[PDB]
Amino acid sequence: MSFETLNKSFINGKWTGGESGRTEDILNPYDQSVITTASLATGKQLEDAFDIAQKAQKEWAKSTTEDRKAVLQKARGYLHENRDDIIMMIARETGGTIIKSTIELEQTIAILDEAMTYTGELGGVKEEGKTNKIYRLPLGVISSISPFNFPMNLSMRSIAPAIALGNSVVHKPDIQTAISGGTIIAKAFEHAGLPAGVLNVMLTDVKEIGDGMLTNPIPRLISFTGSTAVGRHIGEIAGRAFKRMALELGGNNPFAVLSDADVDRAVDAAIFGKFIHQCMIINRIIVHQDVYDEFVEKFTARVKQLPYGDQTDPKTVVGPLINERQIEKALEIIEQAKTDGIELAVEGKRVGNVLTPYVFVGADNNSKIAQTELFAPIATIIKAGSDQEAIDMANDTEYGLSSAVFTSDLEKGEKFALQIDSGMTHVNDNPWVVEEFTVTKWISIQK
Amino acid sequence: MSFETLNKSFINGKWTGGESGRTEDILNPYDQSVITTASLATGKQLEDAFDIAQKAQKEWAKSTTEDRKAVLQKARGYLHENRDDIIMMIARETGGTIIKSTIELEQTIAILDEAMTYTGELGGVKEVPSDIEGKTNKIYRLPLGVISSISPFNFPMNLSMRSIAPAIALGNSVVHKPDIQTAISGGTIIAKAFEHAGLPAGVLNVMLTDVKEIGDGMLTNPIPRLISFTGSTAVGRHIGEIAGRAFKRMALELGGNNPFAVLSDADVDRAVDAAIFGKFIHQMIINRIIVHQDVYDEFVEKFTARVKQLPYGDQTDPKTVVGPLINERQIEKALEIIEQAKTDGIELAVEGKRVGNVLTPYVFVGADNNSKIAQTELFAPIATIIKAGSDQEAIDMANDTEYGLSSAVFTSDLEKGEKFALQIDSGMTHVNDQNPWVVEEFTVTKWISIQK
């Protein structure tokens, strides 16, 4: 319950100071107070870490199903037994509310449970004088990067299966969320007796390491979550080295409300999806003309009653943004939409480091504000002429990760979801992981 | 049967001349004689083709299983009925031997036979209903969209069809670019086959062009969702960067240093034989051959004697083993490499020579695994034999390559071969020789949650 102590890189089963001579003060983004001070690791220390991970993995690739299922279970136990303090810390460092923070811890725990489920997945499938043995083997070293939003959740999304499948990990969280994004998790794994070097958490920054996490020839996978513009950068470096990539990108996710929507429920989903749960990340809310005025009115009034302020207060829904730079980003976007004439149904303010909700209405699906991945409590409502047009406006974007469609007709929701060019869709709002973190090897044997 | 008539692009169901002004003579490698002349299509034409492929794919996605099996059947049917003429043409264009060409036409047919088994795959699975009551999670198997497909001058037809047939099977469309020098066997014949089969206009587009016209056109167009490529590593990196930046999928196959390991307990005679078929008849390219010490001298003598016999010359002759190299730049490249190893000290057990555009086999022996001739991709009839002092070193030496795609191990102990096979960083190992992974490559997984 003294996580602030956990301010160092974890390399080789040992807490290590950064030898860069620099520090980052990690702040509560609501009040700008220091939670803790972290020394930053070097370009050399990262290199040593990947070496160490390469070594440790050759051993970890030979551990039993037992040990691995065991390490994960103890690690999950550590998190669960300490859930109260961890949720608090997550909220402090992250600026996510107690509600959001709880969901993140639990999601993290669920990942661990899920990963226990495929620990025994390293055997062989035994398939005209020939015979064909298919084998599932560990990939190698994995390079893991997580962002400032949902940092614990998204870290474990890589760290858990990696370890579950005989891999090793060099993990780098955003420094401003290092504790939630790396050092708590590192403690759980140490606690659970993870062999030295199978998990390395790096407290560092760009000034120190450049593209060190992407450029090193050792790792055979870059797992990343963050913006698409950083994605593009990672994707170009990795493709060029022929590294496998597990990219999860924020996207421009359309929330479509159809002619036959139950509106109250749509409002609920939109409010909860956009702010409380902060589902997917919602940017554009496309609504059918026949229920437009109603949906706008109720959404607008429900938005204006959302409490904002200190995230550590259970009543708070909209907490501060992570830092200055993100506040400026949201403001520039908001200024631009204003000079473009787009109406502001709800106009917010900068209060300290909290940006209060904005709601833009009657926007073009093609407008600059509609076509922007934001991560701010900014909503853009867009009128659609028909259900077909709602579906097409949803398609008119280059970033589709997720989508939501609200409709009373579940059959027709499903036919419409199939037309949305995206991996996931929710109508009224498991095996493929193993594959990302393993090599299927083929041996043909002759008579 | 006048396959030289097929010197055009096949765009949107039509034989379409090139609009660039420029033309290239497609040559027989042995004598430099002109098979046809092909007009080169333009950047603009390629963009039309991608545009056209995107449209046709929306409609092709709506095809039934039967529609799709029928198209493949008539396609495989066209190639088998016409096997004799096709084999001849693959040989003429490509400089590959009638034997090599027959194997290639056969493998191409095999690929079409295989596609039919999974054309059925485009349908929805349910599972994992979530903790929430009233919630249903459904996964559907849908087409990817438009495939960008690029093939090289060696094994043009086989490699092209390795992308064309699954693509079309799984409701995709395709813009395809063979090396102009092998456009007939790498493109036009295939287009003729699918046309014969009543494949809708626009679903298969074959571009006769060159990079001089098209620059990175196959790579940069926002349309296609997968780039399929076989060729050099440096072009690979160039594709990886462009496709990585744009988040397109990529099926890259890159040269290509395949080790042949021959362990102490191996049957030598089987191993010499299998090394000849792989290195000379079939051409999976065996670059360097690694042979354990106690069986080394026996392998060399046998492998050398046998290589010395092989028939060289006109590749259209059904008993020629070593035909011409694809072009003159390949010969100069081969010879300069051979000079490199000579000045470097490496023994030459068997010395080849240049007859016209044919080079006769060269065998270098007792080479370092860390040698220029050992580490280099060539695709020339050059073999390199490397001494190993243990079976573990043999396998170590096989590993130590820029990259490994395929490997071969020869051992009497089948348990030992499988366990060493497991120790090589390579997708495939065969012991004593020489598809659901594809369905995932050419389809997308769509997930839908519904709520009651």
Measure the CA–CA gap between A216 and A143, rounded to whole angstroms: 9
User: Which residue of chain B comes nearest to A413, CA vs CA?
Assistant: B450
CA atoms within 13 Å, Cβ hemisphere of B326: 19
Mutate to test the interface with A, among B267, B451, B452 (most CBs of A within 10 A): B451
CA distances from A136 to B165, B424, B436 (A): 27, 14, 15
Residue with tokens 């949107």: B12
Please tell me which of the candidates B242, B422, B431 has its beta carbon nearest to residue A135: B422
Cβ partners under 8 Å of residue A217, min gap 6: A241
Interface contact B216, partner A, CB < 8 A: no
Known catalytic membership, residue A248: yes
Query: Using omega within 30 degrees of 0 as the cis cutoff, is the peptide bond preceding B256 cis?
Result: yes
Pairing of strands B358-359, B406-410: unpaired
Q: Are B215 and B58 spatial neighbours (Cβ–Cβ below 8 Å)? A: no
Q: Say how far residue B288 (Cα) sits from the centre of its chain.
A: 19
- Encoded tokens for B158: 């086989």
Is A220 strand, coil or helix? Answer: coil
| 3-state secondary structure at position A367 | coil
Of B241, B422, B450, the CB nearest to A428: B450
Residue B121: DSSP 8-state: G
Strand partners, B449: A426, B137
CA distances from residue A86 to A4, A70, A77, A154, B437 in whole angstroms, order as listed: 11, 22, 13, 15, 41
Which one from A47, A59, A114, A279 is the annotated catalytic residue? A279
Does domain B1-255+435-452 bear CATH number 3.40.605.10? yes
Spatial neighbors of B373 by CB under 8 A, at least 6 apart, are: B337, B338, B340, B341, B344, B346, B364, B367, B382, B384
* Tokens representing residue B172 in the block: 């995709």
Residues B352 and B362 sit within 8 Å (Cβ to Cβ): yes
Q: Which residues of A touch B437 (CB under 8 A)?
A: 440
In chain A, count H helices and then E strands.
16, 21
User: Do B431 and A441 count as a contact with CB atoms less than 8 A apart?
Assistant: no
Minimal C-alpha gap between B260 and chain A (Å): 14
d(CA A348, CA A321): 14
CATH class of B256-434: alpha beta
B234 is in an annotated binding site: yes
A320, β-bridge pairs = none
B130 is in an annotated binding site: no
Which residues of chain A does B247 touch, with a Cβ-Cβ cutoff of 8 Å? Answer: 231-232, 235, 247
The residues that bridge with B362 in the sheet, in sequence order, are: B382
Within B346-430, where are the H helices? 372-375, 391-399, 414-421
Record the tokens describing residue B98, joined without a space: 């009638």
Name which of B27, B87, B98, B94 is nearest B311 in CA terms.
Answer: B98
3-class secondary-structure state, position B407: strand
Q: Which residue from B240, B252, B431 is facing A443, i.e. has the nearest CB?
A: B431
A138: DSSP letter:
E
| Domain range A251-429, CATH class | alpha beta
Q: Is A141 annotated as a binding residue?
A: no
CB contact under 8 A, A443 and B433: no
- The one-letter amino acid at A384: A
Domain range A1-250+430-447, its CATH number among 3.40.605.10, 3.30.420.40, 2.170.130.10, 3.40.640.10: 3.40.605.10
Taking an 8 Å cut-off on Cβ atoms, the answer to whether A242 and B247 are in contact is no
Which residues have a Cβ under 8 Å from the Cβ of B187 and sit 6 or more positions away? B10, B151, B156, B160, B176, B177, B178, B206, B207, B208
CA distances from A280 to A248, A251, A274 (A): 12, 9, 8
Experimental method: X-ray
Dist CA A85 CA B291 (whole Å): 62
Kindly list the domain boundaries of chain A, sorted by start residue.
1-250+430-447, 251-429
Instruction: Pick the closest to residue A198 from A243, A165, A244 (CA basis).
Output: A165
Is position B206 annotated in a ligand binding site?
no
Do B418 and A443 count as a contact with CB atoms less than 8 A apart? yes
Data resolution in angstroms? 2.5
Q: What is the DSSP string of A323-361?
A: -HHHHHHHHHHHHHHHHTT-EEEE---EETTEEPPEEEE
Structure tokens belonging to residue A129: 């004088």
Distance CA A119, CA B354 (A): 58
Radius of gyration of chain A (CA): 23
The answer to whether A318 and A356 are in contact (CB under 8 A) is yes
Residues of B in contact with A428 (CB under 8 A): 450-451
Taking the C-alpha atoms of residue A82 and residue A252, their distance in angstroms, rounded to an integer, is 35
Q: Are B136 and B129 spatial neighbours (Cβ–Cβ below 8 Å)?
A: yes
Residues in A closer than 8 angstroms to B450, CB to CB, are 410, 413-414, 427-428
